[PDB]
Amino acid sequence: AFGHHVQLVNREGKAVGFIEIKESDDEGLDIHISANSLRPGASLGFHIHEKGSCVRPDFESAGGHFNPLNKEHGFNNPMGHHAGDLPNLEVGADGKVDVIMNAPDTSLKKGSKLNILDEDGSAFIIHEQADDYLTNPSGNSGARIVCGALLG
Amino acid sequence: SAFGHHVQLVNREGKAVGFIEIKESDDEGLDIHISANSLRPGASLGFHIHEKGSCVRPDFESAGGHFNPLNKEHGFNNPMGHHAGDLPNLEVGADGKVDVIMNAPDTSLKKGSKLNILDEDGSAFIIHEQADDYLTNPSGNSGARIVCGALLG
Ligand SMILES: [Cu+2]
Ligand SMILES: [Cu+2]
Ligand SMILES: [Zn+2]
Ligand SMILES: [Zn+2]
Ligand SMILES: [Zn+2]
Ligand SMILES: [Zn+2]
Ligand SMILES: [Zn+2]
Numbered sequence: 001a002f003g004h005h006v007q008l009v010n011r012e013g014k015a016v017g018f019i020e021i022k023e024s025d026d027e028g029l030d031i032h033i034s035a036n037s038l039r040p041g042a043s044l045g046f047h048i049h050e051k052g053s054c055v056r057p058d059f060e061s062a063g064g065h066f067n068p069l070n071k072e073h074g075f076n077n078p079m080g081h082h083a084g085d086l087p088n089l090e091v092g093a094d095g096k097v098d099v100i101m102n103a104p105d106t107s108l109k110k111g112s113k114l115n116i117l118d119e120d121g122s123a124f125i126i127h128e129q130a131d132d133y134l135t136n137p138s139g140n141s142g143a144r145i146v147c148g149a150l151l152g
Numbered sequence: 153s154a155f156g157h158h159v160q161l162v163n164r165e166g167k168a169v170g171f172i173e174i175k176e177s178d179d180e181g182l183d184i185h186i187s188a189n190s191l192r193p194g195a196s197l198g199f200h201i202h203e204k205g206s207c208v209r210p211d212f213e214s215a216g217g218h219f220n221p222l223n224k225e226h227g228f229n230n231p232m233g234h235h236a237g238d239l240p241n242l243e244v245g246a247d248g249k250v251d252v253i254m255n256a257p258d259t260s261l262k263k264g265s266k267l268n269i270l271d272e273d274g275s276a277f278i279i280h281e282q283a284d285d286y287l288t289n290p291s292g293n294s295g296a297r298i299v300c301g302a303l304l305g
Contacts, residue, residue, distance in 0.1 A: 002253055022253075026178045034187070034251050098187050099153055100175075100253060 002032055004108070004117075006124060006148040010037060011057045017096075019124050019148050021108065028104035029116070031086070035097050035126070035146065042091045045127030045141025048084030048103065052121015054147035059125060065137065066106070066122055068113045075133040083114055084122070085139075088130050121151040155185050157261070157270070159277065159301040163190060164210035172277050172301055174261070181257035181267070184239070188251075188279065188299065191244045198280030198294025201237035201259065205274020207300035215276040215300065218291065221266045222258075229286040236267055237275070238292075241283050274304040 002020040010016045017035035024030045038044065051062030065073060066084025074080040075087075083105040089097045107114040116122040125148075127141035155173040163169050170188035177183045191197065202215040218226065219237030227233040228240075236258040242250045260267040269275040279299035284292035 032185075032253060098251065100155055100185060101153065 002030070004150060004152060006150050008033075008035055008124070008126075008146055008148045009054060009056075010146055013056055016146060019150075021150075023108055024102060028102060028114075029106045029108070031101045031103055031124075033089070033097060033099060033101065033124070035089075036095055038089075038091045038095050038097060038126070038146075040091055040093055040095050043130035044089045044091065044097075044145075045129060045131035045139055046086045046089050046101075047082070047125055047127070047131075048086065048106065048116055049123040049125050050084070050120065052123050052149040052151045054123055054149045059123070059144035059147040063123070066116060069105075073134075073136045074131075074139055077134050077136075080134075080136075084116070085131075085133075089126065116150065117152060121149055123150065124148040155183075157303060159303050161188055161277070161279075161299050161301040162207060162209070163299050164212070164297075166209055169299055174303075176261060177255060177257075181255060182259045182261065182269075183253055184256055184277075185253045186242065186250060186277075188242070189247075189249045191242070191248050191250060191279070191299070192281075193244055193246045193248050195244045196241040196283040197244060197298075198282060198284035198292055199239045199242045200235070200278055200280075200284070200291070200294070201239065201256065201269055202276040202278050203237070203273065205276055205302035205304045207276055207302045209300075212276070212278060212297035212300040215278060215297070215302075219259075219269060219275055221268075226289045227285070227287040227292055230289075237269075238284075238286075242279060270303060270305060272305075274302060276300050276302045
């Protein structure tokens with residue numbers, strides 16, 4: 001079943017949706033994201049960062065793409081992808097996105113290195129532009145515009 | 153994504169009130185992502201896959217009976233149960249919204265399967281006015297059909 005509810009907040013700390021997580025059949029994790037107040041018809045970058053902490057306005061604070069296996073950024077990068085790299089989100093006419101994505105290289109299991117549940121927590125971030133699955137460290141996805149901290 | 157087979161949900165008045173999408177579960181059966189609105193805040197609402205992909209307003213009787221390939225009685229708590237199409241109640245927010253993923257372990261999209269909901273007829277997902285008591289034939293005393301979406305084909 002889905003759980004570990006995470007609330008999503010924008011630059012101004014307004015609630016703009018939520019995330020929940022399922023230990024996947026199969027395998028790794030499934031991420032249910034349901035958001036609003038986003039740039040309509042946009043394609044928007046989206047990653048798991050290494051610090052469960054969401055400080056306005058900019059969310060630097062932190063990280064850090066979740067990168068326990070110390071690779072570079074991007075699906076299409078031969079040296080790359082960060083365990084926390086996820087596909088771009090597609091926004092409805094709406095301004096809303098409501099999907100389940102699989103993060104195959106993540107975990108909640110204790111003693112797991114891919115464990116995104118840990119002392120520090122992890123944070124889910126939606127970026128301002130679309131990700132190019134290639135450029136370090138960011139895929140040129142731009143500013144951090146939405147954040148959600150996972151602890152527990 | 154791997155969720156697909158998008159199904160638009162409509163109420164008795166013909167208002168668009170969200171959607172369903174479906175995933176072939178590994179494992180097993182299907183996972184149903186339901187994201188609906190304009191429902192009774194804080195209610196538990198009956199929720200079933202019906203046998204025919206037909207959602208004729210306002211009553212939705214054109215969807216025909218709960219999907220029951222194995223010929224059982226209704227209800228998770230009926231020892232003579234349950235229908236393949238029986239799903240847990242939807243638990244609505246103060247929002248009037250439900251946005252959840254539930255497993256339907258006695259379904260399939262495979263042409264070869266007895267449990268196929270993507271059959272010649274198709275199927276309909278139906279939300280009811282009241283809770284399913286998980287016991288009473290033939291629909292758990294769920295009452296009227298209030299939201300319908302058809303999976304054709
Ligand atoms: Cu990022
Ligand atoms: Cu029903
Ligand atoms: Zn990255
Ligand atoms: Zn039934
Ligand atoms: Zn959803
Ligand atoms: Zn069953
Ligand atoms: Zn049918």
